[PDB]
Amino acid sequence: GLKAAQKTLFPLRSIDDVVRLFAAELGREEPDLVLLSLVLGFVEHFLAVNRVGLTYFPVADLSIIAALYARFTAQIRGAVDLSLYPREGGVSSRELVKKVSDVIWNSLSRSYFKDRAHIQSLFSFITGTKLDSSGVAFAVVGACQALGLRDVHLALSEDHAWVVFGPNGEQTAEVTWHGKGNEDRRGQTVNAGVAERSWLYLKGSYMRCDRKMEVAFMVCAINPSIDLHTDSLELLQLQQKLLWLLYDLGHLERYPMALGNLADLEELEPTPGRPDPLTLYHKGIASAKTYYRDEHIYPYMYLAGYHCRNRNVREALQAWADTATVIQDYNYCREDEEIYKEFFEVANDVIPNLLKEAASLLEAGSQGSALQDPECFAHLLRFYDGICKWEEGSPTPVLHVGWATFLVQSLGRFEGQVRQKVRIVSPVLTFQSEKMKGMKELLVATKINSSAIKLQLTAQSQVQMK
Numbered sequence: 001g002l003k004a005a006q007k008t009l010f011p012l013r014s015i016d017d018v019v020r021l022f023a024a025e026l027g028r029e030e031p032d033l034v035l036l037s038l039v040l041g042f043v044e045h046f047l048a049v050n051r052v053g054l055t056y057f058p059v060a061d062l063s064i065i066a067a068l069y070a071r072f073t074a075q076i077r078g079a080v081d082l083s084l085y086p087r088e089g090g091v092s093s094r095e096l097v098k099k100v101s102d103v104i105w106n107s108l109s110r111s112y113f114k115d116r117a118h119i120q121s122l123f124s125f126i127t128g129t130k131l132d133s134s135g136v137a138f139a140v141v142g143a144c145q146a147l148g149l150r151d152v153h154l155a156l157s158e159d160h161a162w163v164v165f166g167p168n169g170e171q172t173a174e175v176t177w178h179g180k181g182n183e184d185r186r187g188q189t190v191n192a193g194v195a196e197r198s199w200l201y202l203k204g205s206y207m208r209c210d211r212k213m214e215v216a217f218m219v220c221a222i223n224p225s226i227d228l229h230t231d232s233l234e235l236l237q238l239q240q241k242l243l244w245l246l247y248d249l250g251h252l253e254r255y256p257m258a259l260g261n262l263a264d265l266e267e268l269e270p271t272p273g274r275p276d277p278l279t280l281y282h283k284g285i286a287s288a289k290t291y292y293r294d295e296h297i298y299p300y301m302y303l304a305g306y307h308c309r310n311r312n313v314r315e316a317l318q319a320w321a322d323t324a325t326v327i328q329d330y331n332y333c334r335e336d337e338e339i340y341k342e343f344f345e346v347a348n349d350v351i352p353n354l355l356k357e358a359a360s361l362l363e364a365g366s367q368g369s370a371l372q373d374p375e376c377f378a379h380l381l382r383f384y385d386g387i388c389k390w391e392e393g394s395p396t397p398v399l400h401v402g403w404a405t406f407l408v409q410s411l412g413r414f415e416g417q418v419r420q421k422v423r424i425v426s427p428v429l430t431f432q433s434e435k436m437k438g439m440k441e442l443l444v445a446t447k448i449n450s451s452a453i454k455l456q457l458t459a460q461s462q463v464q465m466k
């Protein structure tokens, strides 16, 4: 409206007052996405973008919030004439969803840096005419809610967002761009992407949000960063509190990445009486397994990162092997580049640096070292196996000789006597990839045959002539 009931908590004078507002909205029939995004964007702006004059908390006055709210609703109601798009059966049409997307798109500043921080919220849309990619999709859903289109909901993969709508919520539509210099498919379904088995569309095991999960998304989307070196403590605490509120009410149950976000926050600043970060990382994984056919990568990456930061090498390698076991059943497609970059950095930067430190500590006499544990060697091998299997059948290759050099170095960190203890059967490990099956021969020799490993990993046919 705003409705009288939605106004009684203003002014918001603290983090806790913001939490109370979220609680109140989440106790309603339909939490007001527009109101909630405006409030978060307002407080983020004055805690992270411009902190001039800050003494404790940027007071959100009703007159201020209500004026922003009216600017949004007047823009949408003015530009989208619902009489032109009659709704059969309380459900929206493709043309209507497309018109809402066009209205948001057409409002954006002609030129800007699309991956700035702090352009995710309706506060940025109204005050700056700027939105990041997923922010446009969220704004489409908020605008649809404001228009009374109760069937239009946010859909999320691990690197993209769109909407679902229509009879049974079974229709999909693209409403924003993906990536940089991909040509947009706004208005179309995501079925081609699902059919080709790209990571981007998760083989169809993407999140279909309800109104409560859309609230969880805008909370995950809070960006506490003030600059490269500094986070807003006030925004970290607000995000954390809001995540716990959603958790308590059951609305993170089907949101694996929100559980990982919450785990990361608890590691930073634990809340007394709450589950450890480990427990939360594992609930994130359980959610992916229960609701999404265990087809998500980030729940295991979140876990691996935690183990990596805490130098649990064994447990980090296991969790990375698990990430590879997920990815092996996808086709690597154009538009999946972000997950390629992550596997590349793990394989070619993170693991080498973890193993380099492990090797120094072994020289210094550590016991129970990952480098003396054949189960750890097995994890490393399973990680590469899933990456090789991913590559099989895909329309673009994954591996190249840049990867081979790191593989050789990482294998070499484990003594031959440790490597020999892994039993590779067609500790026991089975390979799914043909690349690693052919490699089995080479993996246990006291001297690693670097050139042969390189040839096998890159399927390079020939060696130099001279």
Ligand SMILES: N#Cc1cc2cc(CN3CCC(Nc4ncnc5sc(CC(F)(F)F)cc45)CC3)ccc2[nH]1
Residues within 6 Å of the ligand: 134, 156, 157, 158, 159, 160, 161, 217, 220, 257, 258, 298, 301, 302, 304, 305, 342, 346
């Ligand atoms: N090893 C290791 C490792 C851990 C790790 C953690 C991160 C942190 N990111 C994990 C992924 C998070 N992404 C998300 N978190 C919650 N909800 C959503 S919905 C969505 C798709 C959309 F942006 F909407 F198009 C993305 C996303 C944002 C933070 C990024 C890389 C990481 N590598």
